[PDB]
Every structure is written in C-alpha cells, then in structure tokens.
Design an enzyme around this catalytic site. Sequence first.
Site, PDB file in Angstrom:
ATOM      1  N   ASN A   2      32.658  47.986  29.466  1.00 39.13           N
ATOM      2  CA  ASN A   2      32.617  45.958  29.652  1.00 39.13           C
ATOM      3  C   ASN A   2      33.507  46.351  30.717  1.00 39.13           C
ATOM      4  O   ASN A   2      34.525  47.071  30.406  1.00 39.13           O
ATOM      5  CB  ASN A   2      33.216  44.769  28.662  1.00 39.13           C
ATOM      6  N   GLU A   3      32.772  46.816  31.517  1.00 38.04           N
ATOM      7  CA  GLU A   3      33.289  47.102  33.064  1.00 38.04           C
ATOM      8  C   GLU A   3      34.103  48.375  33.337  1.00 38.04           C
ATOM      9  O   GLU A   3      35.555  48.200  33.409  1.00 38.04           O
ATOM     10  CB  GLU A   3      34.399  45.716  33.406  1.00 38.04           C
ATOM     11  N   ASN A  13      28.802  41.378  35.519  1.00 40.49           N
ATOM     12  CA  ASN A  13      30.088  40.665  35.695  1.00 40.49           C
ATOM     13  C   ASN A  13      29.934  40.234  37.351  1.00 40.49           C
ATOM     14  O   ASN A  13      30.396  41.528  37.726  1.00 40.49           O
ATOM     15  CB  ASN A  13      31.228  41.045  34.511  1.00 40.49           C
ATOM     16  N   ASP A  54      41.829  41.568  29.372  1.00 39.40           N
ATOM     17  CA  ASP A  54      42.390  40.089  29.122  1.00 39.40           C
ATOM     18  C   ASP A  54      42.672  38.925  27.981  1.00 39.40           C
ATOM     19  O   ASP A  54      43.949  39.196  27.996  1.00 39.40           O
ATOM     20  CB  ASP A  54      41.167  39.704  30.021  1.00 39.40           C
ATOM     21  N   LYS A  92      38.360  29.898  32.102  1.00 46.94           N
ATOM     22  CA  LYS A  92      36.576  29.618  32.120  1.00 46.94           C
ATOM     23  C   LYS A  92      35.910  28.552  30.785  1.00 46.94           C
ATOM     24  O   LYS A  92      34.670  28.663  31.543  1.00 46.94           O
ATOM     25  CB  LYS A  92      36.051  31.688  32.473  1.00 46.94           C
ATOM     26  N   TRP A 118      30.786  32.841  31.046  1.00 49.78           N
ATOM     27  CA  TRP A 118      31.336  33.274  30.952  1.00 49.78           C
ATOM     28  C   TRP A 118      32.832  32.328  31.142  1.00 49.78           C
ATOM     29  O   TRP A 118      33.045  31.895  32.082  1.00 49.78           O
ATOM     30  CB  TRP A 118      32.297  34.872  31.804  1.00 49.78           C
TER      31      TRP A 118
END
Lengths: 574, 585
Positions: A394-395, A449, A164, A553, A534
């Site tokens: 992460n993810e 997450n 992102d 966010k 987040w």
Amino acid sequence: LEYSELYPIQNEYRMMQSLDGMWKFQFDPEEIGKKSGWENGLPAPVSMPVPSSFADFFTDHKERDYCGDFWYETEFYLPAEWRNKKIWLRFGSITHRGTVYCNGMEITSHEGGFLPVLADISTVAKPGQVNQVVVKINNELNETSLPCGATKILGRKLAKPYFDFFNYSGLQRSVWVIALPEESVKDYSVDYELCGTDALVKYEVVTTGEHPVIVRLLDAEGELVAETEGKEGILQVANARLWEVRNAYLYQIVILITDGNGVLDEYREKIGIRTVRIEGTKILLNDRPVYLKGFGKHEDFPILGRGFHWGIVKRDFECLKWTNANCFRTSHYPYAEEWYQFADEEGFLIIDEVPAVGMALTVPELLKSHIADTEEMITRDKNHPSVIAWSLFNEPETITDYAYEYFKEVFAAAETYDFQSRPMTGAFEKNSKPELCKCYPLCDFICLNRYYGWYISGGPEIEEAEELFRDEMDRWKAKELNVPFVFTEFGTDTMAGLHKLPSIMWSEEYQKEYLEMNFRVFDSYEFVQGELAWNFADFQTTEGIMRVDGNHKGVFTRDRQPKAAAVVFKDRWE
Amino acid sequence: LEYSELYPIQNEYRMMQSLDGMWKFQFDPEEIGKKSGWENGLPAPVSMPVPSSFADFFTDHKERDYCGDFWYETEFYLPAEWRNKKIWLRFGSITHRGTVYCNGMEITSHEGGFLPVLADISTVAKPGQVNQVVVKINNELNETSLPCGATKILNNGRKLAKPYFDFFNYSGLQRSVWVIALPEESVKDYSVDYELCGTDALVKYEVVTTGEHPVIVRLLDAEGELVAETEGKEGILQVANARLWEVRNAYLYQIVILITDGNGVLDEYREKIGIRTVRIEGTKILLNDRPVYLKGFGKHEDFPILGRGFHWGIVKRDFECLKWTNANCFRTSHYPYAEEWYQFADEEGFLIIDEVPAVGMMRSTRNFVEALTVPELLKSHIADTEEMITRDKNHPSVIAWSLFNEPETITDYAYEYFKEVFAAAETYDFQSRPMTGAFEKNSKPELCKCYPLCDFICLNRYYGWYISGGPEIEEAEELFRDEMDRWKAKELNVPFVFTEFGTDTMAGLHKLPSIMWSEEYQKEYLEMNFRVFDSYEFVQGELAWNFADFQTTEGIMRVDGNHKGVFTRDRQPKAAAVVFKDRWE
C-alpha cells in the site's frame, strides 16, 4: 512453515480450549523482564482483557501511548487426556513481535503482528495440571519489519508510524491451546475448474506423516458429493452449486488420515467452489464480469481497538449489505480469520492485504520480513472463497528499478505460495505516476489510491480536481495496458453533524459532492472495474494537527452509523 | 434450587467448554417454531453473535424492535472423556425467558433475564459426538415477571415492547454460554460469613453437595499458602493475622472445597473470597469496623452495538474510569450484572449494591404506558431474589441487596408485599448483610410504609432536573432541603444513600449562563446537590445517575437514549466527571 496455519477445530482427534479472558499484564519500560525472571511470572501485573488492544483502557497518556516491551501472562488447566498429543499454543496474533514462554521455557518467537503465532509446547506441557504461558511483546516500529515506522526516545519511547492508523498492539485476537494427533493434516490447498454444470476441486494435502489420505466433499446439508484418495487429487462435483457474489454456497471438505481400518486425523473446513480471473479489463467471477463495490476497512472499534469481536463483524456486514457492497479490502493488514469465514458465508469478495505500508541497506531484511508475512497470509487465507486477490503493498515507492527488483521477489514468492495463482495487486499512491512507475507491470490488475478533491484541489478547486483526475486517467488510458483498474482509496474527512450550504471540506455535503465527482470520472473509463471507498468507518489514528480524533473519511461513524454519503453509495451500488 | 449457581471452573474433576461465537438465529413472529420442529434445527437462520443483545446489529426497524418469540441454535463437539460426568449447559443469562432444548429434547425453562440458566443435559448428551442446542426465547414484558412492562399489539399483529422502565428492552443471549461437566457427586453451593477477632478472623461456612461423602475445606492466602483447614459441611476456618479485604484495597483468599471418599478426592471447588464485614450502626455504614462513605454511580450493562452483551474490555475501561473518579462503589441498576463484573470488583476493592430487576412497579407510568397479577409478580420477584443472592453472596464486593427501584410504597398492601421479599432475602443470605431499595419521590416521608423494612434508605431524587430545573434551581434546592428536613425530623437513625441524581447532558452543549442539557448545568446541578447532601449527617453515600449515557426506548424525552451519563456511552468524560473526581479525592 514449521507449523500449521489451519484454523483450530474440535473433534475426535483434535482438541481446543480458549485462553481468552482476563490475563495478567505488565509494562517493561526498563527492559529487565527477561533479566529478572518474568518468563516465570510477572512481578506486579494488572489485569488485561484478551482479545483486545491495551491502549484505550487506561486513563493516563503514558500507558495509552506505551511503546516498547510489555508482558502478558495467564494460567490454564490442561486436561489429562491431552497427554501425548502434539500440544500447541495458538495466538490469533501477537502485535507486533514477541516471544512465547510456557512453564518457564522459551518456545518460539514471531515477527509480524497480524497473523497467527504457533508455539509447540508438547515437550513442556503438563497434562492434568495447571500450566503457565508468558508472552514478551514489543510494539516498536522500524524499517526492517511490517508495518514500517520509527521509534522516538524522549528514556520514554514513542512510536512514530509511517502509516496513518493508530499503533494499537497487544493480544488483539483470541488465544487457544490445542491438541493435535502425532500425525496430522498440516496444510491443504484447493483450486477450482468449472466444467459446464459440473466442477473440479483440485487439491493438495500436506501431513506430518506417511499414512494414506482420503478426501471427501460434503454439500451444505452434509451429503457426500465426492470422494478420492491421495494427498494430491481431484474431486469431481456433479451439478456444482457455485459460490456466488452475495449469494454464497459452501461445501465442506473433509480430510482423513487413515491407518488400515482406523482414522488418525480428520480436518474439516467450509470452502466455496468459485473461480476468479482477470480477462482483458474485466474481473471475472465464475466466468462473469463483476464490478467491485465496497470499502477499505480497519480492525477498529471504540475501546477494544483492533480487538476481535463477532459483534463488530455482524454489524459491519449488515451495514455493508445495506449499502449494496460486494467487496472489501483488508487495509492495511490481514484481519482476524473470523472476518474471512464470515465473508465466505455472506458471499463477500476480499482483497487480502499484507501490512506492507509505510514504505538504506535495511531493505534486504525488510524484504525477508515482507516475504515471510506474505507466505503466512497466503498459507492462512488461500482456501477462503471470499479471497479473490492479494494486495502486496500500500503506497510504496515504485518508480525506481530498485523498487522493481524488490517487488519482483515479493510477487514471485506470493506466486509460489498460492495454489490458485489468483490475482495479485498493490495499491499505488499518486506519486507512482504512469510515466514513472516500474511496478504496475507486476500486477494482474491495478489499484489506485486517489484523493482528487481532497488532498489535491479540494473545495473551491474541485472542478480543477476533476480535470486533473481525468488528465491522469487519460494518461493511463493511452498506455492501453488492457488491465482492470480498481480505486482502492478515495474519500474526504467528514465530521458527522457538520452541515454547510454551500458545502465546505469536512462537511457531510462536501463528502457527497466529492463522491459524485469521483463517480463521474470512474464511469468515464471502461477499464475501471471497481471502487472501494476510503473508509468504511471513522477509525483511530496517531493524534496530530491533521486528525480530529482519528481519521474521519468514514462513510459510517466509528460506532457504525451512516453519514449522509452512505445513502449515496447505497443508491449507486443498488 | 435444583441446580448450582457456582461459576464454572476447569480442573481435574470439572470441565468447561465455551459455546460463545456465531450462533444461528431466527425470529418467530407467527409463533410456529415448536409445532414446526425448530427445536431440531432452525429452518432459515441468520448468524448472531453470542454474547450480545441482538437488536443493534440490524439495519431495519422491525428487526431491532422485534418483540415476541425468537430462537437461537448452535452445535458443539462433546469430548468423549466427559462420559459418566454430569453435563450441563450454563447460560450466563437468557433474556427474558426461554426454553432450552438439547439434541431435540426439552431440558428446562427459565423466567428472568439477568441470572444464570442451568440445563442438565446428562441424559441426552452424546460424548464423542457433535451435539445440538436450540433455545426458544421470548422478550415480552408483563406485570407478572421482572422487569415489568406491557406488550402492545399493532394492528397488523406485530408486537412492540412497552417498558415501565427507562432502559432499552435489549434481549437475546447477552452473556457467555458454556457446556460443563461435573463429578456425579459435586459441590452445589457454599456460603461464607465473617467475624473479626482483633488481628484474626473467622470464616464461618456451609457447604451443600449432591452426596453424602465427607467435605474438607481449606483456605489459601493470595500466594497459595494454606492458612486454615477444617472438616465438615458446616464449620469455621480460623485465620491468624488475617489480611482483610478493604475498600479500594482488595485482598483475596482462595477457598478450596473438597469432597473425599478417603481413598481420594471426588470433587474440588475453588473460588476467591475476601474477608470483610459489613454492618449498619446508627447512621453509619461500617466496613471492617469503620465507617465508609459510598462514592460512585448507578451503571448499566450497555455499550455501543453489543447492547448488554458482556465483554471484559467494557469491564476494564469502566473500572479504570471509576478509579480515575476516585469512586468506591456502584449499584447494579437495575438488574444483576454478568458475574464477571463482581469478580472484578472483588479484585479492585469496589463495593457493590446488588439489585434485583424489580423495576417498573410504578402505578403512574404503568397507567401512562392489580389484584390478580400481584401474587404472581411476588413469586417471580422472590425467585429472582433467591437466584441473585445465591449467585452473588460470596463476593466480598457485594455489601448490600437492593430489592426494588421506585415501586409503589405508600399503601399497606405494598408493605405486605415487600415484607415477604425482604424475609426471603434474609433467609437466602448467609451473611444477613444490609438490605435496601431505591425510593422515588412519590414515596413521601409522611406516606411511605416501606422504608422501615430497609437497613439503610436509598433515595432517587431529581431536584434541579425533573423538579424546578434551570431558572428554578434555587427553588429546587429549597424543596430538596425541605424534604431532607422532614426526613431529619423523623430521627430514623439510619444511613441515607442517594442512588440517583443527575441531569441529561449533551456532550458538547455549552452555554453561558448554563441551560438544562448543557455541560455547565450538569456541573452546577451537582454542586447544588452536594451542598444539600453535606448538610445532613445521616447522608452516607452518593451514587450518581448514571456512570455513562445508555440506550433507552426512543421517544420525545430521550435524545438517543439517556444522557445523564457523567461519561459518554463510549466512556469519555463530560465536564462534570472532574467535579466528581475532585470531590471524591
């Protein structure tokens, strides 16, 4: 490693000089710099602040969005007294990859944009003269280095991240030139054991020679509390003053190399006596359970981009303390070293994250890059008391045996590099369903997450969102894994000033209601032991139809002011 | 001066080490620090970034608004090789006033928050050891130093700054701090002045050193090639086919000043300079023998969180925005900026009006918020003027000195006051470049006694904002023309520059038809002002208020600071920015 990660210090044996300031800078769209002698000086530079991301200075799109090769140059005077020391250029980072030249000579190259780059210029340095450094940098994204993405060719290149956050790049951290003694402390590691009112500091020291080592521990007042001899040993501390959550105490370790009756080198660093371990579903700090409260952050600020500045650290920590937080994750890359130094001071807990975001045969090469970044991160950060866990992804995809074999290697490497063997984890995206995920067994504790109430069943469906959330957590509960769970992402995009009654997605009021719902779910499961929201603050992203000037966010605005929901965290974490 | 204003450099003779970073910091509301030995170390400090203003880090009002004594401390290792050097602490500034201690010893004190503070620590420095610096700072406002204001004492003893000016009272260590080492005999000051002789140029110079040994002066071109060389502490460098420094088209030579004893070199100071002349001729401002029309802004040193804290990133963004508007000039409203701003202007070919912090001398706002204080104020004012000019004189970008902003000017007393300031400025400026100040509307053409002191006249006017705004804007234009017709009829034959005009403008506030505070009104206001500017031959510059939204004291008339920015505080353009861009193109 072929170099030291140790933070540079200044004393009788070690020198340092800052290279920060206005550098020369030039874009290289045709990729002809190395063909055209640029390593000896840029032909038509502009000025560029260092440290800083270059992107947001410019007023034209093509410069802001530049993707490809680009160059930095500066000059520095080297004191004559540095003669016959080991002389190094030390970049806090070079984003994403680059080649360092000094006085026209290629010195070293580095891949990975969020960790120190060391370049030994001993053989080309000119003491008592002006010296030149030129850096060729590249900021493209691929699938064989971290963080992953693609590069689109319009011949103009455009970065296409699989993540992102905006593709900021350049020389985003301070640059030093340093001088070390010919035989020096290259690395050291500390690990702690608590013994009633006393403590043991176990250590290893690596030097570049064979001379004897002495290790001392000083208290916060500089008083000698322990001393021992050898590159390996134990420091015995009577009535140890433990480093505690939001209540730090820092000792000073002093590592001496000696040659009969003289000192050859002396390294000092502040450390904190503390233990961390996972016991059942609990996270124990100094033998007592702690519940993690805080945020994922970013290195992100108006104009500077990811450029380091102590002022951002100071404001952010004051905001963090005001919310009654005790922890943050370095989403999604290791931060400037200074962030950890300050966390040490303020007693904050850190989950230190390698830039394994945005996850073909290319995978073996990716794995090498991922392991290299992990080695560098852990070697750099292991002696910070604040760092209590490593986040190694992460993810990513985690539901194939293929993914399992990949992460088995990463975790194995991390384990060999961390003297403390402190908890290792990774942040799982929702697609890592409990029935499918193969990788959660690798973790000391599990990080989730989740955006139940935002990406899933948001707004009018928020009651459905809560049931879906409880359904998944019930599935995790049924597994009886006996490990802690920490939520490392949850939040809603929230435009400051957008008020609505009744609330709508994107309003300040919906952010509050979303959080309240998530808290109800969190508090329903005994094994949930942390909540890192987040994000701490709104931050820059790739532009697009889903991003209204970056990611909103944040609980704080980008200039670090509280939205309505910040108070909700403050009251709950009190 | 008892010290050098010269920017620090690193070479064979001179050394420097940055002290920037996280310092220790402690408020001293009870004013007990000195009697409690704080100069030997603060007892319960917090961390504070340097450079930065301290105010905006905190989350509580009383720390943000703190007024009184407060202390900074850090430690640094001094290289052994600096022994037998003159060792100085150099603060870019200390805001507003302070006393510097080193290793527990009082070194020096300084009044004035926007110019360098030099502390000679030679006699207490410990080479090859860790040294300590502690600074006691005070940020109160008074009527005997610049910028002026008052200090209010709340019933519980707490102090609150009450400025007579419209910028937030930021303070602390807002600029970089170095420790430096100089040769025992060093270059302390130098001055250059330029003369154009066809295709050639003369660089007249003076050099002040701390000794008696011979001086050699060289000039190198931008490629480092020698173009001129002479000897003596006073002399002339002859430059054949000189490449002049031009507006938005800079060229910088490097002056090299050597102290020698025949055997060898004792000191060597180097600085980039630009060959250019500035003079006023009739109603024209002449740069290099050609009229220039000033286009730009008053600015501030102001940025989110850092306050007035210096950062090269802010310089870079601001200059890119300035160039995008096609500007060529800014005024350092309302205090000298960090030296780096001028260094960069030199490079980018920007013109600077360098302004001393003589702001807040307006009787009306003083009363709203004297025989015995004015003589002391004049002394402070002249001292700041001397320091500013000594510091900044050799920048090619600096084309004018602004010696005041909106003082009382309509009495004979004010004339005598400013006569002394202008006289002082003249003696300190080797170049004798144009001097001015910015006048408030109360300085009516029929009443003002001070404009004859100026080489060109700067006016701050808000016709269409404070005067006849909004539905009355037509009347505002009439009133504006009326005043300018009065100025015109005086036939002063001097240039007029507008140094303030603007409207508070909330980003995102749109209205049709426009209202005061809307983006559309900012455009319409500017268009009206341009029509008036362009009606008078003797108007030769327009510097809008302000480049960017900036922090002020809070109050009922300030909606999170001042919103007359053409850019937002995070440096993005309102609708009016394009109006300037198109006009100045």
